[PDB]
Amino acid sequence: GLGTARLQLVEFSAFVEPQRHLFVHISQLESVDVRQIYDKFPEKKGGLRELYDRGPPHAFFLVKFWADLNWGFYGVSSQYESLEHMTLTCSSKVCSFGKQVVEKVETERAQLEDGRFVYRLLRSPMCEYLVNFLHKLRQLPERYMMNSVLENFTILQVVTNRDTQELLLCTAYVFEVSTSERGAQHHIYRLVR
């Protein structure tokens, strides 16, 4: 799954409510060469290339989403777990044409539950950049046109141990829109080099 010995992603949804509509949903491996995606993120250099250099490599994952854009409050919910008690820092960086346009930093302390520690970042309001972007994208008359536009938009999430600043998970997200009949889908890849 998306995870290491220390921390695993358990759930990730992005949605809109008035029952909710999920754009993408992961509820919990082939590899991809990270060089194939260097150009979709800033040379911040805090961005992808720099992080990967400093490792470790097994903490780095690529998720490819086929979103359901076929549908208020817009939210993002994430849930992780581990066997160690930590405080997590979760940074989410939205990029457009290789430049960072949003950075969102949240922290979450472990919550003991059924024998392990869960970290629940539930119903964060989606950044308005993205809410506005989705409403425009929703205007396009053809799915192929939405995919042209989305080729340029990516998200980079970095989850570190807040007290030690050790990187625990780094996840690159890329996006296409699914057809009106095929639901949402995702595939998770290990990033290697």
Side-chain angles (χ1 to χ4, degrees), residues 9-173:
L9 176 80
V10 158
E11 204 92 19
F12 173 89
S13 73
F15 54 93
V16 53
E17 300 177 328
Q19 302 158 357
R20 65 186 201 184
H21 173 80
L22 318 176
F23 307 108
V24 294
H25 181 44
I26 300 181
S27 188
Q28 281 194 143
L29 232 45
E30 278 174 55
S31 82
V32 167
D33 197 277
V34 55
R35 302 189 217 96
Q36 300 180 238
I37 67 171
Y38 276 176
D39 65 323
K40 301 200 169 49
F41 304 82
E43 300 299 348
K44 254 285 185 180
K45 288 174 289 298
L48 184 48
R49 177 199 306 277
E50 186 179 71
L51 294 175
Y52 197 86
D53 284 356
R54 311 191 299 237
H58 67 268
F60 286 81
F61 289 97
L62 169 63
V63 173
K64 158 61 162 264
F65 275 118
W66 288 263
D68 186 341
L69 295 202
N70 201 6
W71 83 105
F73 178 74
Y74 291 75
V76 178
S77 288
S78 311
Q79 191 177 323
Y80 308 85
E81 48 171 25
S82 52
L83 297 184
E84 314 168 53
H85 181 280
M86 295 167 300
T87 292
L88 290 185
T89 297
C90 306
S91 170
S92 286
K93 295 189 195 63
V94 179
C95 306
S96 172
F97 300 89
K99 311 194 162 190
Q100 173 188 306
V101 285
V102 182
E103 182 186 30
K104 176 154 80 177
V105 181
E106 281 203 302
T107 73
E108 183 62 20
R109 194 157 187 280
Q111 159 66 39
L112 162 71
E113 170 176 313
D114 312 328
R116 88 276 200 244
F117 294 108
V118 296
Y119 307 76
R120 290 196 174 105
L121 291 90
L122 309 184
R123 307 173 52 89
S124 182
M126 182 181 299
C127 60
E128 298 92 328
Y129 177 86
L130 281 185
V131 175
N132 289 321
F133 178 61
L134 289 182
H135 275 283
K136 293 167 187 180
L137 198 58
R138 194 69 200 293
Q139 286 165 241
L140 278 45
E142 298 289 338
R143 202 181 52 93
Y144 78 79
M145 297 184 173
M146 301 169 186
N147 291 343
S148 303
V149 171
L150 276 176
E151 275 187 52
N152 310 294
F153 290 77
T154 57
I155 293 176
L156 180 66
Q157 283 196 314
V158 179
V159 175
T160 56
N161 186 326
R162 188 187 145 270
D163 299 326
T164 55
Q165 288 131 113
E166 290 168 312
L167 160 77
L168 294 168
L169 264 191
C170 173
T171 301
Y173 291 97

